[PDB]
Amino acid sequence: YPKKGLSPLALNTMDQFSSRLIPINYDQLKKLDAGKQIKLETTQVSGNF
């Protein structure tokens, strides 16, 4: 959506419309500090043709 050579988007920018940030406690922070990694995962999109 930002084409190749443009700047990326952002998430949960603080404005009139926004949402609360995503929190981590200590043990999940240590799990990220180990060799596990974060999955982005899409449920369902909505478009047109």
Place this chain on the structure above:
Amino acid sequence: NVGYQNGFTANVTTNYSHTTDNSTAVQDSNGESWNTGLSINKGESAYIN
């Protein structure tokens, strides 16, 4: 202060004030006192006949 309420909120308040004061007081007092006491002189301390 900052906070989250339908998005970001921030407020910065300054404040100053000036008060004055004056007062009186009246204090009475009353009292009594007693005292007793002796004396003696060792050497020529009693007469006889």
